Amino acid sequence: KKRKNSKKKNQPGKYSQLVVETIRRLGERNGSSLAKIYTEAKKVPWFDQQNGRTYLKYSIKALVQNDTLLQVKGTGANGSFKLNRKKLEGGGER
DNA sequence: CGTACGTGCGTTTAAGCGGTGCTAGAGCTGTCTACGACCAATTGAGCGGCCTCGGCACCGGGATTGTGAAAAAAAAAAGCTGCA
Numbered sequence: 001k002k003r004k005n006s007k008k009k010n011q012p013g014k015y016s017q018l019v020v021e022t023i024r025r026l027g028e029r030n031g032s033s034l035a036k037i038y039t040e041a042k043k044v045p046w047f048d049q050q051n052g053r054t055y056l057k058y059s060i061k062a063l064v065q066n067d068t069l070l071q072v073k074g075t076g077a078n079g080s081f082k083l084n085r086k087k088l089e090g091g092g093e094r
Numbered sequence: 095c096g097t098a099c100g101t102g103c104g105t106t107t108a109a110g111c112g113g114t115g116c117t118a119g120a121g122c123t124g125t126c127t128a129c130g131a132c133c134a135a136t137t138g139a140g141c142g143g144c145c146t147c148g149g150c151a152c153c154g155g156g157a158t159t160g161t162g163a164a165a166a167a168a169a170a171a172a173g174c175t176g177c178a
């Protein structure tokens with residue numbers, strides 16, 4: 001349907017998935033923080049201890065831009081990120 | 095319940111050792127006089143004694159500040175549902 005419309009929607013990577021799973025899994029409040037999600041994110045056996053935190057940082061920055069996720073205050077530290085996916089297109093928009 | 099610490103490995107580092115070589119500077123000696131003790135005479139700073147009057151302790155009255163109770167809202171929290 002037209003040009004740059006009805007697009008691929010490439011499935012996110014295992015860390016970007018873990019960020020979303022973890023945010024919903026313990027999410028019933030006004031925001032889930034970077035440091036919070038990291039705390040039991042690393043409980044997962046395949047999680048790369050040395051870099052994982054940085055991967056989760058890449059994910060959250062991209063998920064917010066995607067409009068998959070949204071920040072309650074979300075500048076640098078604390079941030080707090082609620083999945084804003086609920087009331088949206090869900091299919092992508094420019 | 096989360097992870098900071100303790101353990102134990104293999105790998106890396108530089109302390110420790112014994113030695114040599116060089117000389118700064120610690121420390122000793124001898125000399126000589128500037129400086130401090132000691133003294134006697136002089137006298138004025140600082141002592142005790144004494145008097146006074148204004149600060150400050152104490153009081154009463156009023157202004158002000160902070161606390162706690164009760165009632166009522168805002169909010170998290172909890173237990174309760176069917177679905178999916």
Ligand SMILES: [Ca+2]
Nearest residue numbers: 095096097098
């Ligand atoms: Ca702790």
Ligand SMILES: [Ca+2]
Nearest residue numbers: 119120121122
């Ligand atoms: Ca000397």
Ligand SMILES: [Ca+2]
Nearest residue numbers: 141142143144
């Ligand atoms: Ca006096």
